[PDB]
């Protein structure tokens, strides 16, 4: 029943006249109701009540306007990149990872923001300032302290709005919102509110605004003081994948320090929540702002891998949900490209191709890894990285990054009640154990003490090495010549807390030989080989098919090696004097033939304990093991022990 | 020339002519005179005043939510209304008589 309206503005003495036709305008614009916004505007509101509703909102002080520069994340199209529409994914574009490809931005953005809802509610904290907006959105929602502190971050492709809401025990509730985006793209304000009076940070084009009442602002300022300047700086100047990785490391530090078991209401935690929201928004808005073009598939994979990791981590910890930023077309494309490479021979490709393949494996198969064959891929990425890596040395940055990207599907599969990739997961864990030495642990502890990228991931997190108590760790810790000693202590604490069995219930609850042992707390190492699997513990009750005992000093805990034949336990230990480990002094150093492939090597010390574990795989590993500086026969406390596939334990002590 | 706003009720359907003042007319008050259709002599035109800032914000929101299907006329309306919104300050209105033009 709406018609037209004439607006008249007598400004600067001159009268201008405009005409608004609500008919046809409403016909060509769906979901637009003029009378709804007319009621929501409170047109008849007197000046007194309008001023009262104005002063009920925390107005910030005028900031200076920090000059920043956004980065260059999304590149230009690369030559003959076949543009793919996300709505129609044909299985004929699977010309391997070598063929350049990009995905069209409009259907991709429509798939990411497929869901639509209201994001400016009719609640009291937001009704005063914002016109009720209903649009296509994606949200990240979490609630901690038993639904007593909730954070909901909704986002379009133009702006993100996060909202904290804490319900006190008395019954009252305090709400505070942070809106980040482009100043021209921020939502429409209601009443006499402008944006300069609410802006907390502002660059050249971007803006970060806070919306709350003075009372709620004080109640939040009590326990929440965020560095909005550096927050906005990191949100604007960083790229998508880099910001996602930064938020990932922050969430890892939160999971170590106290953990998500008891989430703290510290500024760091709420900052990390809003930064998760910003990390998702930085991919959504970046895809939506390129202007109907297409985004490279490499960039898409590199960003959505980090996004899926963040989603999995916030769902594991805070039980948070992420509705949106999915794109089923991207999932189909990644799963299609996955069938173009052999997972068993994935490690023979270039490191860039390996990272590409692992990105696509995480993107196209995010559903808890129902297709478990991806594990055999990651194993192939690790095994190939094992034979070409200098033994007993810290992992290089490139290798650490590659293995961190590859280990996500292994982490996913390790949290399953059952898994068909038993031996593959066992081989992955055995290689992870053999990679964890003293120098690797030292590098991890250094990175954790400073906070660099080295402490983000290492194979020792997935290792079958249980002997790492406190004393052993801060003995393996680096000599803090230019480090904070308390930081090294905290790094050791976090390193040992992540390795806990109570941590998310991973480890090896489905390992077949894991059920042979009884006193599981006295286990020091598990080695899963092809036929038999060895257990190194300090208890003679291992329940295996044999029982060995290596040379060790008095007082110090004994070293009991017990094999398990074909992953099948026996009745109960051996009920006899433990076997003597046969010595080998009739051995030659030069071995041109690959006669040790498939065994295991343990260098241990009688007084301290185990030092090095090595899965002796290809001819390169056997070579680097044999004739090198590794074999020292100086200290009478260090011994070298060999474990075969036939279940026979030996001790090597002669070389000529 | 000026007006006063109190909160008889006329819907947006019976609105035909709205009149928005400037930052110098009625002090710094953003006021809007809403007048019914003029068609007929049996039918009198009723004029009720309202908060000009709220009307300008409502129309800015409507025009922004329909920017895809907007003529240059309505685009000029949007620009001039945005500069009109920025011409009134909600501050420097605290100690002023919020009922400056109520004659009782």
């Amino acid at each position, epitope marked *: 029943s709406l018609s037209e309206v004439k607006l008249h503005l*007598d400004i*600067e*003495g*001159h*009268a201008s*006249h405009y*005409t608004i036709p609500w008919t046809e305008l409403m016909a060509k614009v769906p979901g637009l109701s003029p009378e709804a916004l007319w009621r929501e505007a409170n047109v008849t509101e007197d000046l007194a009540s309008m001023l009262n509703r104005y002063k009920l909102i925390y107005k910030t002080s005028g900031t200076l306007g920090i000059a920043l520069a956004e980065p260059v994340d999304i590149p230009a199209v690369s030559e003959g990149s076949m543009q793919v529409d996300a709505s129609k994914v044909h299985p004929g574009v699977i010309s391997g990872l070598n063929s350049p490809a990009c995905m069209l931005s409009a259907p991709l953005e429509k798939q990411l923001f497929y869901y639509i809802g209201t994001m400016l509610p009719n609640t009291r904290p937001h009704s005063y300032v914002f016109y009720q907006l209903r649009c296509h959105l994606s949200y990240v929602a979490l609630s901690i302290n038993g639904d007593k502190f909730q954070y909901t971050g909704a986002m379009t492709s133009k702006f993100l709005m996060g909202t904290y809401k804490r319900v006190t025990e008395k019954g009252d509730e305090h709400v505070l919102s942070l809106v980040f985006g482009k100043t021209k793209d921020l939502p429409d304000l209601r009443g006499p509110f402008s944006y300069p009076s609410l802006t907390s940070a502002q660059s050249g084009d971007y803006s970060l605004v806070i919306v709350t009442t003075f009372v709620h602002y004080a109640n939040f300022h009590n326990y929440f003081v965020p560095n909005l300047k550096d927050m906005f700086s990191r949100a604007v100047t960083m790229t998508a994948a880099s910001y996602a990785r930064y938020v990932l490391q922050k969430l890892v530090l939160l999971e170590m320090k106290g953990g998500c078991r008891e989430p703290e209401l510290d500024t760091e935690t709420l900052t990390t929540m809003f930064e998760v929201s910003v990390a998702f928004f930085k991919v959504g808005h970046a895809v939506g702002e390129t202007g109907n073009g297409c985004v490279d598939l490499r960039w898409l994979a590199k960003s959505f891998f980090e996004l899926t990791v963040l989603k999995d981590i916030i769902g594991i910890c805070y039980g948070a949900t992420v509705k949106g930023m999915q794109s089923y077309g991207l999932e189909r494309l990644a799963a299609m490209l996955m069938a173009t490479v052999k997972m068993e021979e994935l490690g023979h490709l270039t490191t860039e191709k390996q990272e590409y393949a692992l990105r696509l494996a995480t993107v196209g198969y995010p559903k808890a890894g129902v297709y478990s064959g991806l594990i055999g891929g990651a194993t192939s990425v690790l095994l190939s990285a094992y034979n070409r890596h200098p033994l007993f040395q810290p992992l290089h940055t490139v290798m650490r990054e590659t293995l961190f990207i590859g280990s996500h599907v292994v982490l996913r599969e390790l949290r399953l009640n059952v898994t068909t990739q038993g031996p593959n997961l066992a081989l992955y864990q055995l290689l992870s154990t053999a990679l964890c030495s003293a120098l690797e642990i030292g590098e991890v502890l250094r990175g954790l003490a400073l906070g660099t990228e080295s402490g983000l991931f290492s194979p020792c997190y997935l290792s079958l090495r249980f002997d790492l108590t406190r004393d052993k760790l801060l003995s393996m810790a680096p000599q803090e010549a230019t480090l904070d000693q308390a930081a090294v202590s905290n790094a050791v604490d976090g390193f040992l807390g992540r390795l806990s069995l109570e941590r998310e219930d991973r480890d090896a609850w489905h390992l077949p030989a894991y059920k042979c042992v009884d006193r599981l707390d006295k286990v020091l190492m598990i080695i899963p080989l092809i036929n038999v699997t060895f257990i190194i513990s300090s208890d003679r009750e291992v329940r295996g098919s044999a029982l060995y005992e290596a040379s060790t000093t008095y007082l110090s805990s004994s070293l009991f090696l017990s094999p398990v034949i074909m992953n099948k336990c026996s009745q109960g230990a051996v009920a006899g004097e433990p076997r003597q480990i046969p010595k080998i002094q009739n051995f030659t150093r030069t071995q041109k033939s690959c006669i040790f492939c498939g065994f295991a090597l343990l260098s241990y010390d009688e007084k301290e304990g185990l030092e090095t574990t090595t899965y002796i795989t290809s001819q390169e590993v056997q070579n680097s093991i044999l004739s090198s500086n590794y074999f020292d026969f100086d200290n009478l406390h260090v011994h070298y022990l060999l474990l075969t596939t036939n279940g026979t334990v030996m001790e090597i002590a002669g070389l000529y | 020339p000026c007006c006063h706003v109190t909160q008889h009720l006329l819907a947006l359907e019976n609105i035909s002519d709205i*009149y928005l003042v400037s930052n110098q007319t009625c002090d710094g008050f953003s006021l809007a005179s809403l007048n019914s259709p003029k068609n007929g002599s049996n039918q009198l035109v009723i004029s009720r005043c309202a908060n000009g800032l709220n009307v300008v914000s409502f129309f800015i929101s409507i025009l922004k939510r329909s920017s895809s299907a907007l003529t240059g006329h309505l685009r000029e309306l949007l620009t001039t209304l945005e500069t009109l919104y920025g011409s009134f300050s909600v501050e420097d209105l605290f100690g002023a008589n919020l009922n400056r033009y109520a004659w009782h």
Partner: antibody
Amino acid sequence: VQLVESGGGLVKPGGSLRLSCAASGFTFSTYAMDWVRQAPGKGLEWVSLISSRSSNIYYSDSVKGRFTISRDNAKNSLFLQMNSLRAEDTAVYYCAREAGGFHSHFDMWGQGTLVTVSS
Amino acid sequence: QSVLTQPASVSGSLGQSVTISCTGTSSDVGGYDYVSWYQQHPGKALKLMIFEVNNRPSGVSTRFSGSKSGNTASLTISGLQAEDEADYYCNSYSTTTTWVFGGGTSLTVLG
């Protein structure tokens, strides 16, 4: 409320000419002032419009980047500068006052000045 | 450009009435809003006779009246006196060209 133009005369084609326009008897900073010309023995056409304190100005497509408006403070005078004149600019120029609030028409006019653009 | 059209020849016998019109497009904004009519006289500086379609200023007589715009508008002069025959122009607000002005009508009294 007298309103006087002055400042017009004979000029060469492609030259320059500065028309003045003195007004009195009313608050000159409250109303917008327009320049409207009339060819000799022909109809009337709007030239330009200046607002109070020279905020936003309007030019017809027939002048574009050739004529410029100017104003001063209080009851001072209005001005129009003409650069690169052509034969079609031969007309009598009036400076009229626009009406008050929510009005689109002219109030008082001036006597006008004859501007003849001929070689 | 975009000037509005009005007839040049207009005549009316003494003592009666005569109607002038100036058609337009979006300048007459459909519903009647803001149209003016001025008289010119020989060598004079114009005087507003009608404004806002059909509104008269103080000092003018009720002989002049305005008609519904619709899309053409009209000015009716009743009781044509001696000072009535002259040049008459119409003016309107144009959303495209700010002001749209008349071409001119030379009204002459025949009686």
